[PDB]
Amino acid sequence: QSITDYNYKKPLHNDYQILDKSKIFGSNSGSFVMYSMAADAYYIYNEKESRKRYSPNSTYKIYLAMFGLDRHIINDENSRMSWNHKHYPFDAWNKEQDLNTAMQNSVNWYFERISDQIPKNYTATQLKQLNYGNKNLGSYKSYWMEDSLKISNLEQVIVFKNMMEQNNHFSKKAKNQLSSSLLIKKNEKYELYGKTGTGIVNGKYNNGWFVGYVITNHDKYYFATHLSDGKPSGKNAELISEKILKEMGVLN
């Protein structure tokens, strides 16, 4: 809504390293950001582009999950929600869900039902304390879907790292339940957690994301890929992320 709503301009006070991942991006346009806990350092491809703010789309379901956990809308014994019988074009949505199935299959209605229960002032207080992008709730509806709420690729990393790693008002059991819902891959070398996001405008992919973290035996890394052009899907942002993480030594 304002002059600072499309841009993150706050100086990075940390050590940073500029990357060149242009061959992995190919004909897609966007940015990649990673933070290493042990190094306390950022690694950024396309720094200017990493500070442009975009709708988070389904990546904001990380925060809706944390809010629903925090407000006891869902819990550890029961995160189940029945389907309202409305037919969706993907059968994974046309059934009962829990936090794990809804996160994995990005089931909008589950997180919409969570959001509808959450008072605007709580969200405002949370987005302020978390420093979540432009903090702009607009109409307070599906505000995170190609709407007023926007966040930069650089901020996706800072905000998620700070939420998970600081002793804040979110409980340890909530953070662990959210993590369990985000786990994608675990082997002898790493655990990989994350969440895709895709914005679709007039039939075309507009906006792709993959935001997450990696735990190895040595370090913990938070990362985010944003795609703004080319074939900017969540699936593509996930693939590009995996290729970059592997090149960097994060996945072994």
The catalytic site residues sit at 58
Indicate the residue among 39 and 145 with the shorter CB distance to ligand IM2: 145
Q: What type of residue is 6?
A: Y
By CB under 6 A, the count of residues binding ligand IM2 is 12
The DSSP secondary-structure symbol of 97 reads B
d(CA 184, CA 192) in angstroms, rounded, equals: 6
Site string for ligand IM2, 24-53 (x = CB under 6 A): ------------------------------
Query: Alpha carbon of 173 to those of 33, 75, 124, 194: distances in Å?
Result: 27, 9, 23, 18
Indicate the residue among 44 and 178 with the shorter CB distance to ligand IM2: 178
For ligand IM2, the binding residue among 36, 79, 106, 177 (CB under 6 A) is 106
User: What's the closest the beta carbon of residue 104 comes to ligand IM2, in angstroms?
Assistant: 9
Site string for ligand IM2, 139-178 (x = CB under 6 A): ------x---------------------------------
Indicate the residue among 16 and 230 with the shorter CB distance to ligand IM2: 230
In the bound state, the residue with its beta carbon closest to ligand IM2 is 58
> Of 151, 216, 154, 211, nearest to 190 (Cα)?
216
Chain residues 191-250 in contact with ligand IM2, contact rule CB under 6 A = 196-198, 234
Q: Is 108 an interacting residue with respect to ligand IM2 (CB under 6 A)? A: yes
Please give the distance of CA 107 from its chain centroid, rounded to a whole number: 15
H or E segment to which residue 209 belongs: strand 204-216
Q: Which residue has the tokens 């190094």?
A: 39
Alpha helices in the chain (DSSP H): 22-25, 47-50, 61-70, 99-104, 108-116, 120-130, 153-165, 172-182, 234-248
Q: Kindly list the residues in this chain that would bind ligand IM2 in the complex (CB under 6 A).
A: 57-58, 90, 92, 105-106, 108, 145, 196-198, 234
